[PDB]
Enzyme design. Structure first.
Site, PDB file in Angstrom:
ATOM      1  CD  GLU A  89      -2.649  -0.872   2.614  1.00 31.50           C
ATOM      2  OE1 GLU A  89      -3.320   0.157   3.277  1.00 31.50           O
ATOM      3  OE2 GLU A  89      -2.155  -2.048   3.110  1.00 31.50           O
ATOM      4  CD  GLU A  90       5.509   2.637   3.824  1.00 28.46           C
ATOM      5  OE1 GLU A  90       5.673   1.658   4.120  1.00 28.46           O
ATOM      6  OE2 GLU A  90       5.994   3.789   4.437  1.00 28.46           O
TER       7      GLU A  90
END
Ligand code: CL
Ligand code: CL
Ligand code: CL
Ligand code: CL
Ligand code: CL
Ligand code: CL
Ligand code: CL
Ligand code: CL
Ligand code: CL
Ligand code: NA
EC number: 3.6.1.5
Lengths: 386, 385
Positions: free
Chosen positions: A119-120
């Site tokens: 995600e990050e």
């Protein structure tokens, strides 16, 4: 006008961002004093006060009428990944204490969670490409580096486990992202000390990554306190030791290479992890930025040959000189710099393979359009659907 | 409901039809070698796949056909082809795709899966089939021509945390699974490593080998031997196009010489500087672990026993052996001494299954009329079960 708040709970700092939108812009940022929240594992009751200053800033900053409608998110990254790894229980306690604390302000509490690396790295790639207006075509790779992990996210020309498909303004995107936990600049340093400390050390660690005359005292239980060093763990005959700078860039490089391990693909990052061929431009932010930026500003604010030369020179400046030379810089950063720079060079060149023609396609940035390059805007975006 | 998965491995492409608990309805082995051998002649792929594909159109009811997903997952054979030529691999995958796309099924992609996706799915596959998700789980040992995986949960929770690790939340439990895939450590690629190493320049064009039975001879072309990335580290200038392997049929020495193609920052490793946690709990070894060990088992349990059986079998002259087992394909039969000895070193020295640990391994072909293999495990993913 609408507002949103995202806390980026990274391993060295918790940064709070306030966004607003009539295109979305960063209204303000606040850096919470202290380390990251994982350092609160014992003393979670202290978290409330720790967050107080940045939270009070936000209640003084957003108009009171807009406050109950304003969402608040905490996304935690690698620091907390590591804490969870050590104790699920602890990490949960920390997240709950954070939650109770944020819940108490007059905003719309929307959750505190540990976001994935996949995600990050995605979100930060979004943030940058959004910010350059590159969504208003073709796009920029995103390189992130913090205390604990490092991410790289970009689109290659046409290994599924590692990719993301994502449609955005009518275009379907396949984006390569990966996160190397234990490869943020601080965990690497830990890894490097663990590995280099032999039993015979005597409680003295001569180290080429720190300036002639530096001393720092290091605690064995803290050092073995993190999962990133489990692999180098030894039973040691002293409860701590002292690092002594020898400031030699050569060796410090050599010794940094050791914390990285053939490759089952066309090319790899490190540790057998796939890396596609390099493509297009990249923005390198956070620690990448701040570190490179410090070195760049001794090169008339250039090339890999010249950056390396700047670092070799710098690493040999005795500590007293370094301090005296840069008196307005926090002693805590200034001391890391020889290590960090050396580290960053290797990570980009051997690691991400930015050798040869590839080096200049990296542009280091703190902010785009007066807005922090990071992942929290991206997170904000997807989360609002704006 | 029905689904189809092609397992494109380095020796064979196997097509499975599942239907639905999910069961294997049928399997088909595509005649010939693996798809990587088509690198030049990709236009031939269509016909190569034709028999097993027609079987499936004859087998699934026509009404159910457009709704039926079809996937091809390729493993280490194709990893090696990609390593030699990205372009070739892509051309092969595309040719496969055009061919599959043309059938009346719901084409869902042809891709090279990772060794971890491979170790994962196979571990899932057995535990599903053994009803284990309800409790706790079994480790998975898979062996093929080109690669070998090992996949299991260690007691520790997270310990080494090196990205030898996955998460897999599965019917309510988050599982921290260690998995690795040793490319070039399939039985065939390990064979070619060994020949490649042991061939001396002086040789005369003959390699005496103790992993083959007295009187065994095979001629080996040097450009095939060096034709794989796996012997890259062993390449030498040789004064001949080919040479002949001559069994001296001695297990001791075969073992010796096998160890040599193996080489650790950690508390412990597998082999070659790769991390391995402590062995923990029980294991199902399959594919070549099962087809080779089962062969030996049928000449009877314990490890000293399976060793005595392999020493003995390695001494039987090749004429005797072939006479003893006339119904077996000389291509498998001729490899068994080597494979047996291989398997035994892999499990004992590689994976440290020594002593007490040994009996935790259950070799298995198939559970509930369904194969141990990654394919079913994939199938449960590819319907988000
Ligand atoms: Cl943290
Ligand atoms: Cl970080
Ligand atoms: Cl850190
Ligand atoms: Cl000094
Ligand atoms: Cl200064
Ligand atoms: Cl193949
Ligand atoms: Cl294989
Ligand atoms: Cl093979
Ligand atoms: Cl027979
Ligand atoms: Na590299």
């Amino acid at each position: 006008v609408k507002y949103g708040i995202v806390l980026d709970a990274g391993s060295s700092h918790t940064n709070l961002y306030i966004y607003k939108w009539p295109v979305v812009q960063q209204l303000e940022e606040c850096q919470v004093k202290g380390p990251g929240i994982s350092k609160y594992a014992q003393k979670t009751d202290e978290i409330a006060a720790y967050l107080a200053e940045c939270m009070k800033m936000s209640t003084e900053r957003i108009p009171a009428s807009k406050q109950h409608q304003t969402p608040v998110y905490l996304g935690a990254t690698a620091g907390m990944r590591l804490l969870r790894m050590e104790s699920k229980q602890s990490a949960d306690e920390v997240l709950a204490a954070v939650s109770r604390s944020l819940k108490s302000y007059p905003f719309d509490f929307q959750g505190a969670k540990i976001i994935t690396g996949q995600e990050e790295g995605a979100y930060g790639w979004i943030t940058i490409n959004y910010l350059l207006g590159r969504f208003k075509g073709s796009t920029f790779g995103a390189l992130d580096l913090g205390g604990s992990s490092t991410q790289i996210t970009f689109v290659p020309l046409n290994a599924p486990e590692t990719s993301l498909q994502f449609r955005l303004y009518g275009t379907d995107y396949t984006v390569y992202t990966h996160s190397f936990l234990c490869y943020g600049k601080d965990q690497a340093l830990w890894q490097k000390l663990a590995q280099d400390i032999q039993v015979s050390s005597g409680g003295i660690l001569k180290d080429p990554c720190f300036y002639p005359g530096y001393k720092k005292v290091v605690n064995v239980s803290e050092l073995y306190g993190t999962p990133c060093t489990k692999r180098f763990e030894k039973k040691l005959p002293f409860n701590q030791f002292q690092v002594q700078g020898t400031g030699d860039y050569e060796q410090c490089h050599q010794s940094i290479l050791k914390i990285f391990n053939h490759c089952p693909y066309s090319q790899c990052a490190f540790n057998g992890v796939f890396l596609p061929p390099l493509q297009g431009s990249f923005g390198a932010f956070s620690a990448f930025y701040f570190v490179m930026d410090f070195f760049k500003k001794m090169a008339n604010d250039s090339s890999q040959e010249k950056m390396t030369e700047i670092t070799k020179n710098f690493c040999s400046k005795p500590w007293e000189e370094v301090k005296a030379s840069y008196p307005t810089v926090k002693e805590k950063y200034l001391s890391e710099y020889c290590f960090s720079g050396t580290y960053i060079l290797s990570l980009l060149l051997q690691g991400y393979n930015f050798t040869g023609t590839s080096w200049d396609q990296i542009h280091f940035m703190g902010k785009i359009k007066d807005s922090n390059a990071g992942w929290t805007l991206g997170y904000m975006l997807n989360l609002t659907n704006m």
